[PDB]
Scaffold this active site. Sequence first.
Site, PDB file in Angstrom:
ATOM      1  NE  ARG A 250     -59.887  -1.104 150.264  1.00 13.11           N
ATOM      2  CZ  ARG A 250     -58.898  -0.224 150.336  1.00 13.11           C
ATOM      3  NH1 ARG A 250     -58.121  -0.150 151.399  1.00 13.11           N
ATOM      4  NH2 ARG A 250     -58.692   0.608 149.318  1.00 13.11           N
ATOM      5  CG  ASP A 251     -63.994  -1.661 148.590  1.00 16.22           C
ATOM      6  OD1 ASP A 251     -64.751  -1.224 149.468  1.00 16.22           O
ATOM      7  OD2 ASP A 251     -62.790  -1.351 148.530  1.00 16.22           O
TER       8      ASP A 251
ATOM      9  CG  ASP B 287     -66.794   9.090 147.368  1.00 12.36           C
ATOM     10  OD1 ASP B 287     -66.296   8.975 148.510  1.00 12.36           O
ATOM     11  OD2 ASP B 287     -67.872   9.681 147.149  1.00 12.36           O
TER      12      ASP B 287
ATOM     13  CG  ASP C 123     -67.949  -1.867 149.976  1.00 13.25           C
ATOM     14  OD1 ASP C 123     -69.049  -2.432 149.863  1.00 13.25           O
ATOM     15  OD2 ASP C 123     -67.181  -1.725 149.001  1.00 13.25           O
TER      16      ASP C 123
ATOM     17  CB  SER D 277     -61.107  -2.730 145.340  1.00 11.18           C
ATOM     18  OG  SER D 277     -60.630  -2.514 146.657  1.00 11.18           O
TER      19      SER D 277
ATOM     20  CE1 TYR E 159     -63.078  -0.147 152.606  1.00 14.03           C
ATOM     21  CE2 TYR E 159     -61.720   1.685 151.876  1.00 14.03           C
ATOM     22  CZ  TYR E 159     -62.731   0.777 151.639  1.00 14.03           C
ATOM     23  OH  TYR E 159     -63.387   0.810 150.426  1.00 14.03           O
TER      24      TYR E 159
END
Length: 358
Positions: free
Chosen positions: A88-89, A313, A135, A95, A83
């Site tokens: 990312r995301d 999260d 994701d 992110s 990840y």
Amino acid sequence: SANNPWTGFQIFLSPYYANEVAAAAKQITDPTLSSKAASVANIPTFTWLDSVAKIPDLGTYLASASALGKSTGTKQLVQIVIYDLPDRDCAAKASNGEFSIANNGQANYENYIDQIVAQIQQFPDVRVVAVIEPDSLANLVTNLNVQKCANAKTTYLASVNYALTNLAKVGVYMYMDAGHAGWLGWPANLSPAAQLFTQVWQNAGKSPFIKGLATNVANYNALQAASPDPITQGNPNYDEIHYINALAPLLQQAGWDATFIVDQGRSGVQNIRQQWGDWCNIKGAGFGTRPTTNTGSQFIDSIVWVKPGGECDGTSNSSSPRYDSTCSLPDAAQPAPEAGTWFQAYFQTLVSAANPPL
């Protein structure tokens, strides 16, 4: 399939999650609930390699697992999440990824994979199962209108390809992230998703170590819902088993008899979301079905706990540079700390609301 990565192995229990859980349980004041909380440390979870700084932890876990197996006569299995994609995301409002496409993202991500491979290569008597990039690919199905995703598409594909191709060389069993029923399980998204995942599988050489797909990672859907959650209206695939039953034959037709793993770590309580897309610290979540290869489906190798319940999260503080407003919605538990850090009140409710009970 014939070869379920878990059968005959002993899962290595994350000592870090174990340390988070132990510190959390001592703060829970009801004695019955505190002891149930402490026992969560015996439930296997995935280790998230969310940065290069986590790679030495992987090395320690591989070496510890190797020794534990020799001490108990067992073959050990370490569970990881890859990840760290650049940008990312891409569809998020924020992110935490340390790599950016604009700053040599591809080379830096490759080097991250190379460092992981170099650890895994040293411990061939330990099995590794990896979830590949939550994701990420799912955004390339439905979110190409998001400009950050459109601009990240070639990097996501190249970086995921590099991960699959090189982790296969050290025999890692891999499940690519595939969102969840409310993302890619909409009937109209199934074929575009299958086309993307099969292209990715083809580009990585159709390696037998690319076992299939991981669903519901860090999410809250039922595997098998007693009745549809109202958030699912319009989608006949209202739970993960419906999604998987629908998607699997499309992959099979491409020559990939794919199998699946399903996160249930925060699925114990259904009907807790206002909208299906609400993903951040959903209030009232409970620990769900414990990991098991008794999955109820030909397509599913294991129920798993990928996201470690209790790790936040994302922050609800709108002044943080990492703030995503999803984490302030009426169904998000607040106040919430920064992503990945411990969220004690959320953990205590995960324990209290666990279903099946702990």
